[PDB]
Design a protein around this ligand. Sequence first.
Ligand SMILES: Nc1ncnc2c1ncn2[C@@H]1O[C@H](COP(=O)(O)OP(=O)(O)OP(=O)(O)O)[C@@H](O)[C@H]1O
Ligand SMILES: [Mg+2]
Lengths: 483, 154, 52, 51, 546
Amino acid sequence: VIRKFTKKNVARAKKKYTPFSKRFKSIAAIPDLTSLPEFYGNRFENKLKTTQKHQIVETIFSKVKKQLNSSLPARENEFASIYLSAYSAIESDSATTIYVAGTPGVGKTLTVREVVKELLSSSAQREIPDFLYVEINGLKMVKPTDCYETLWNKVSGERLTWAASMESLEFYFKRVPKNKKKTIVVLLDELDAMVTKSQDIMYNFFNWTTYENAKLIVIAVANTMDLPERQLGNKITSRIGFTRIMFTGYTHEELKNIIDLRLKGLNDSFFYVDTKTGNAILIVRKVRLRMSADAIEIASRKVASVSGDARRALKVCKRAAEIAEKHYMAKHGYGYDGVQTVHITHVMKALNETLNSHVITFMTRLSFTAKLFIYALLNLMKKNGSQEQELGDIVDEIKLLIEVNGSNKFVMEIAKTLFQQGSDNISEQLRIISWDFVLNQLLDAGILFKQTMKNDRICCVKLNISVEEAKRAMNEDETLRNL
Amino acid sequence: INCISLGEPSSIFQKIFDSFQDLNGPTLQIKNMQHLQKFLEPYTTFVVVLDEMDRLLHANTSETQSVRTILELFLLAKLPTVSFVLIGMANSGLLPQTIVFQPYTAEQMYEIVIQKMSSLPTIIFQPMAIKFAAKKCAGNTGDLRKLFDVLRGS
Amino acid sequence: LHTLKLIATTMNKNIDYLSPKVRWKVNVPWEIIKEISESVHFNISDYFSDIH
Amino acid sequence: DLSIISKYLLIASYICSYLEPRYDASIFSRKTRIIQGRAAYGRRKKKEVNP
Amino acid sequence: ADAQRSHYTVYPSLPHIPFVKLLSGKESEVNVEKRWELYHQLHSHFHDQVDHIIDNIEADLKAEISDLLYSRCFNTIFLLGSDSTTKIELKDESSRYNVLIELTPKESPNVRMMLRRSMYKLYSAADAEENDVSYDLSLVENFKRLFGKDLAMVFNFKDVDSINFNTLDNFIILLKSAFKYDHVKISLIFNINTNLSNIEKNLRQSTIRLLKRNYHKLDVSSNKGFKYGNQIFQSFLDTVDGKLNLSDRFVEFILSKMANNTNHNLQLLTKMLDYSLMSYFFQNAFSVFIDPVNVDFLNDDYLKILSRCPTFMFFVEGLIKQNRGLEEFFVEFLVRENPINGHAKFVARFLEEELNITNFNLIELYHNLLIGKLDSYLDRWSACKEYKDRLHFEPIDTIFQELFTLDNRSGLLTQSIFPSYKSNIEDNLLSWEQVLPSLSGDLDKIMAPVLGQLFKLYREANMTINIYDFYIAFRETLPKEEILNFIRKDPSNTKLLELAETPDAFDKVALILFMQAIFAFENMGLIKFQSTKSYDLVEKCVWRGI
DNA sequence: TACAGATTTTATGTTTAGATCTTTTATGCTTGCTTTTCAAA
DNA sequence: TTTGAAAAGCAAGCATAAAAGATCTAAACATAAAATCTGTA
Ligand SMILES: Nc1ncnc2c1ncn2[C@@H]1O[C@H](COP(=O)(O)OP(=O)(O)OP(=O)(O)O)[C@@H](O)[C@H]1O
Ligand SMILES: [Mg+2]
């Protein structure tokens, strides 16, 4: 047959369509699912392995940088609340929802994972019954319904399509008796990412916690405390509940304790450093490593002022150690193959490059034509105050600025280059040389905005950057500030 | 039957059939009004309780096609030679009977709480605490779930 | 005449012909209406001679 | 090969498109007034641009 | 309720011809039956000839299109005055494949859809005669590799005067790229309904210069040279020859209506001829005497009706100036030929064959023969000067020939097929006593129907009407005491009596009757509300007689 | 029971019909001023 | 034959309707691999 179009790259999974409600004849026909070899969890790692032919030189700051990587001193009350709710709901065989919200990097996922680890340790001591832990991250899903595919695959071991998985989970949570079940603890991380238009997924996940036979713990980690009030309906907000756990950004003393806990064994300690290569061994010269308490304190105070984000504090300390290690390796010439201190200067330089703006020094290093464009644009904003200027007006005002300051030395040397490219055989041009080039360059830089128009004269252009930093970059130039 | 936990709102008739027919017999394929109407004709009362009946509306389309399935079910629970009694619960001459469930008051919430904890040997709350929790949780448009989380958090 | 696009309307697709909001305009140039008026001996140029 | 009704409708549509409706009674009105009534005076000034 | 649904099917419970009994209901049913059967013989003898004529029209159109089509540029054909309803068939000639690709303006929203539909049609036909492909012009490039044959595409653009000419121009420029492939030849057919000059100014000048390299014009309207309408009129003349005659008013009406229609006046001509035949066989009780077998069934009613004939009136008045015998006279004097149709056919075949006068209409020739001005019709050619005495004819005003005639005096043909629709609506609104009979008797004489009163006050008001002032003007004409007496004359309804007891009853009744009529006027299209959320002023949209 | 074939389910791509919202331009009412033909002296 | 004066026309101003189209979505139209039903061998 002759097709009207073709779909030649269809990749379909081997997922069955029949839900769990048709797996046995009756409710009484359902066996004990705990004594089943595929329920409740009853190969790629070696492809990224090779043989090492050299000996990596780990310098003395490499252990500091390794210990400062992201891979519970400040979360006691949050840990205790989450653990007590989960322990009470597991040991009494009930279903509940715990809500956790906070800004990035305040220890939400780490605290919930530690709670789950301690509950698994308590279930290994036969103090609470066994449970299955499932982690669903909404930003790791391709489609939002794939969470239905994930959770059911973690429960039964089957692979169904998402609608059949949703019916299977509904039948499982509602109809299967508690004597044939295991408790499930589900972490719904990045809860805002699973919010869709119809909000059926959110309703189903929080409504399964209201069923009497469910034995389901849903720990929902969010980014805002008012997500059910802003984005969800009244039905899902009623099911989530009034009790919500806020993870506040860290104060500077807790960030100080976090950084000291990552460096408890390294700070104020001695290393055997081999001066031939640079390789350092933690307990040939005996060198003491030190990072200043003033440096850690000022980085922690800065980070707690900004966000209270532990990732940022660890990254600022790691960047300071990297800067100091770069200077040390440069001054000794070591390569990769008596007191070494990472100081408050390195911490301030790590804190400054994140706060430095390149926009002004980008604009001060442009050519004369791009600066002339920006200067004429600012002149037109001063003349009429419209904040959007047509490109033809910019052309006319560039021409005006050339013919008005014609007695200037630099302008009377630049005019032949601008309008004829220094050639007698080239006619006088309506645009300057490199007009399109500097227009497109300022558009790709994000300095400029241009409307989608086909007439080149009446097309409007807007500053995307702030006006005063453009004026500062214009007054930096010698020629433009004199005319 | 919970309507949100179905794949599509058009399959609910089939779901009703998979809620009724014996598994040893022939499992038929059902689309709409007519096949269910033909199936219940030889029969015995069929009670269906449909939680969230409003999400049976199609959120897309228009006013003509969003009220297709609900009107079809209301017509199929109204005509003779069947025994189909339909209960639908949504959130806030053949039109259905309506009972509005009302938000609970403080005394109602109190009586619900002492009735629920009457199975317990002792009561580890002061009754004034339950009364204060009920009067703060009731207000206007109250939910008993909020009172349950307040007491559990206490 | 509307089918041949010799006259046109404000709306081009899904046209409510009976709507009072729908207004109509001619869609022919002056030379076409000149040749048409010459085919029926109607003096259309007399109607525009005194106005500009 | 257009019809006579179609031709006169096209001519009338061209007139309706390119003449202002306030002046039409000063061109087309020709009936005898039983009732006292003042016809339109007509346009005063010519247009500068051919409409 | 079925009145509130969009649509519903009714299978109504049931517990033999549509002709009724004439002669004041003293006609016999067997004469009704043979009236029905005679109408069907005349209708069938007309429509078999009409069907043969229509098949001949499409046959010679196909022949002329194929002759102009097959006897590095396009082969362009402009079918002028084409309704795009002609089925073009290409030849079957070996070592080359001929594809007809039909494109409509609905099928042409842009050039990409035009090319995709054309290439799908090309690949479908080439697969249907004797691996998937991309539906673009490279299939035209690779056609000889994929099918082993040369390619001839004929593009038939249906209803060109409705297409976007920018899209059509770009599609033709796109099709120009296939000229370099050495095995492809392209023909374009444009079905034009306005004029060639209109489509000239809607295309680019380079596209015109491309189309000018090889193009032909083919004019096929519905009455190109009058040759096809003359056949339909002559077949109608032959089906009533010696049986019925045409008045000059009927032929004049036919010519006037065919002048008002451009593309579809052949079917319009057939439509009024069949409706006139229907009206005669439904109206005239004497149509049974169309058959000369039924003449023995005369009655006193037949002789009483046929005595009121103006030609027989003049004949007996001339006899007095100078029943059984009347029966024999009526039998004997309806036999003769009435040779106007034979003479019209003789003049038509004399002008068409001998003088080669081919741009003549038979209908105006028959009109001039009916009014006796065949010389005044013939002297417009300056070629039959030597035969004016040869083709001279004068009609014989035979008696009771109006009992067997097709004539337009009642305006039944005007009311049925071409009514003054808007004028009839306005006349019925303004003068409702010609609608409603003049038979709650006190109120029906003293107060008009509300729609008619509303239209009377509507007609004498300005372009912009304030509806409060309009409602006061409507209220001043209604009688108060008679309305209050009429509203209290239903004692079973107590809410009516309670509302009539209120002192503001007449204002409320007037407002209710006013608002119902105002919404009726808005639904009919007479009035237009200014704003959506004001509803305080209306504009008249409709004036009577214009 | 196994199994080839037919249909369903799930899943996605293609094209047309129509809705909504924004932006710019026509247009209708207000009000004051100048010209003009028509019903009485 | 005048009169004059009330209707008609001009024009600036301004609120507002509407034309045009950018952006988008529903629905009709279309394809397809895996699973599931289905009638026999
Ligand atoms: N109390 C802590 N003690 C030690 N390290 C911590 C602590 N809190 C956070 N960190 C460090 O910061 C990292 C970020 O924490 P986590 O992943 O829990 O953040 P989060 O609140 O879930 O953030 P996001 O919303 O971006 O996912 C941890 O992996 C860990 O390295
Ligand atoms: Mg996290």
